[PDB]
């Protein structure tokens, strides 16, 4: 899983907003710098900037 290093506020409807420390499952990472992520904390799914998150445990 991944963890957010920064908060992120969605800039389009299909982005995923998240908070620093939130645990994310990366569900698609082959389309570019923006990855499709599923929040394990909120259950929501949307695109995220890959440089705002890092591998977790």
């Amino acid at each position: 899983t991944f963890v957010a290093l920064y908060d992120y506020e969605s800039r389009t409807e299909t982005d995923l907003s998240f908070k620093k420390g939130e645990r994310l499952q990366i569900v698609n990472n082959t389309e570019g710098d923006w990855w499709l992520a599923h929040s394990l904390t909120t259950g929501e799914t949307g695109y995220i900037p890959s440089n705002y998150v890092a591998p977790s445990d």
């Binding site: 920064y6 800039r11 389309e31 570019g32 710098d33 923006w34 695109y47 900037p49 890959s50 440089n51 705002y52």
Partner: peptide
Amino acid sequence: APPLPPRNRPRL
């Protein structure tokens, strides 16, 4: 915070 990356290539 880091610069946001450009949006992905849209698929057709």
